[PDB]
Design a protein around this ligand. Structure first.
Ligand SMILES: [Cl-]
Length: 129
């Protein structure tokens, strides 16, 4: 599924991400935009052979099992393919674990490089939340 901007903002809002660990909703929408372009089916292979999955490009190196990333972990205890649903619940639940961990949203490369330090409020402008 390719989410609309406000559609995704609303979904993230009702799943409790607004100001979760201090990260306002626009940060989460911005992260999803630059990770997956709002596409729940997005997958990308990393140089080390792990793969990023879904709307928030969750990495099999640490967070989910795909059975093809030797030595990796599965900290969200979930098959990576489960992070590709049209329903964002699994990705949000895993994201909340990731963001509470250590370096916060810096765990998402696209967030650090494209959202952090910018005015992210524009990402939720006009949305019915
Ligand atoms: Cl292994």
């Amino acid at each position: 599924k390719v989410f609309g901007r406000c559609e995704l903002a609303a979904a993230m809002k009702r799943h409790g991400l607004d100001n979760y660990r201090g990260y306002s909703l626009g940060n989460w929408v911005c992260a999803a935009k630059f990770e997956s372009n709002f596409n729940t089916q997005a997958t990308n292979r990393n140089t080390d052979g792990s793969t990023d999955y879904g709307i928030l490009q969750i990495n099999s190196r640490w967070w989910c099992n795909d059975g093809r990333t030797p030595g990796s972990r599965n900290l969200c205890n979930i098959p990576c393919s489960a992070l590709l649903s049209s329903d964002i619940t699994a990705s949000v639940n895993c994201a909340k674990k990731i963001v509470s961990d250590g370096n916060g949203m810096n765990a998402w490369v696209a967030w650090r490089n494209r959202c952090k330090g910018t005015d992210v409020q524009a990402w939720i402008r006009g949305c019915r939340l």
